[PDB]
UniProtKB/Swiss-Prot annotation:
Keyword RNA-binding applies: no
Disulfide bonds: 255-290
Active-site annotation: 35, 199
Residues of the full protein shown: 90 to 419 of 419
Keyword terms, alphabetized: Aspartyl protease, Disulfide bond, Hydrolase, Protease, Signal, Zymogen
Family recorded in the similarity comment: Belongs to the peptidase A1 family.
Molecular function via GO: aspartic-type endopeptidase activity
Name of the featured protein: Endothiapepsin
Single GO biological process annotation from the record: proteolysis
All residue ranges annotated as the Peptidase A1 domain in the record: 17-328
Lineage top rank: taxon: Eukaryota
Length: 330
């Protein structure tokens, strides 16, 4: 079996992508953020503190004939600014683009962090990292992908994110019409629970390619591209007037500048990120300073190939016994 679903940017800057997901019987459709950097499927629900719900579609387990409370199970995900989302756990039927899984753990949020409340277009997250990162206690739960693996024609899912345009998440098959050339596969380390891989180097604009190993994670749930400070400094040195701003918290550049492309290596292949993809617009309404899509990972501790990088490619998440990541131009 297979599944295919359209994913849509939530705003004009491609800050995140939402994908419709059917939960329960009869179906309750929620728009979820598909996140390969986490492993929890959590949703706004009728149990969420009412003051923390601002426009989101909520999941109502009492209206689903197939929902079952998972007795004593709780969940808690921590965020980098001290806030957290948490709640209880149900099991229910979950379908993505025609692909149905029964008995999927659905984590109902009892409280959410303020940043989720502020964003009314995201009804929850669907985690697609490895199940060892799932936070359900005392009994850890499997991801949607892990539960679907046996039913899929092939144990893969692919991410084809659009630039200012809709894209596609496919489960169980590789659409050979969605990319050009060949797919280059690279080894994945699962030791930290992420889709972690090693890029073979980078280039700025039309400059010389720099052979150097960059270990990082493919994370559809992160907007920007976070790379080591040496790489990021080399990129923004080619943009006249760009500088790192402490008040803003990253590199900014004059909005009238034209940005150079950024190339990253996948084995012997090269993925080119057009310069326009790195422009994330004015730091404030009316400002002539613009925020950059390539930022330093020094404060984070891990390099992150976020949406900025992934939407330049057709990306294969191969969940075979030995997992691999595939990149192709498109």
């Amino acid at each position: 079996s297979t599944g295919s679903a359209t994913t849509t940017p939530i705003d004009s800057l491609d800050d995140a992508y939402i994908t419709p997901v059917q939960i329960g019987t009869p179906a309750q459709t929620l728009n979820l953020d598909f996140d390969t950097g986490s492993s929890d499927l959590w949703v706004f629900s009728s149990e969420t503190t009412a003051s923390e719900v601002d426009g989101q579609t909520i999941y109502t387990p009492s209206k689903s004939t197939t929902a079952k409370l998972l007795s004593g199970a709780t969940w808690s995900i921590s965020y980098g600014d001290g806030s957290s989302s948490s709640g209880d756990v149900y099991t229910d039927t979950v379908s993505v683009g025609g692909l149905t899984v029964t008995g999927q753990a659905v984590e109902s949020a009892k409280k959410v962090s303020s940043s989720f409340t502020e964003d009314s277009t995201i009804d929850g997250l669907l985690g697609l990292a490895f199940s060892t990162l799932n936070t359900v206690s005392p009994t850890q739960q499997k991801t949607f992908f892990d539960n679907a693996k046996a039913s899929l024609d092939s144990p893969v899912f692919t991410a084809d994110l659009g630039y200012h345009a809709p894209g596609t998440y496919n489960f169980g098959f590789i659409d050979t019409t969605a990319y050009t050339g060949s797919i280059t596969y690279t080894a994945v380390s699962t030791k930290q629970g992420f889709w972690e891989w090693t890029s073979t180097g980078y280039a700025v604009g039309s400059g010389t390619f720099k052979s150097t190993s960059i270990d990082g994670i493919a994370d559809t749930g992160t907007t920007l591209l976070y790379l080591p400070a040496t790489v990021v400094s080399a990129y923004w040195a080619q943009v006249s007037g760009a500088k790192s701003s402490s008040s803003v918290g990253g590199y900014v550049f004059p909005c009238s500048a034209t940005l150079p492309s950024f190339t990253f290596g996948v084995g012997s292949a090269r993925i080119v990120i057009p310069g326009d993809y790195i422009d994330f617009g004015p730091i404030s309404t009316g400002s002539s300073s613009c925020f950059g899509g390539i930022q330093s990972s020094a404060g984070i501790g891990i390099n992150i190939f976020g949406d900025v990088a992934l939407k330049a490619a057709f990306v294969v998440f191969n969940g075979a016994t030995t997992p691999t990541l595939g990149f192709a131009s498109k």
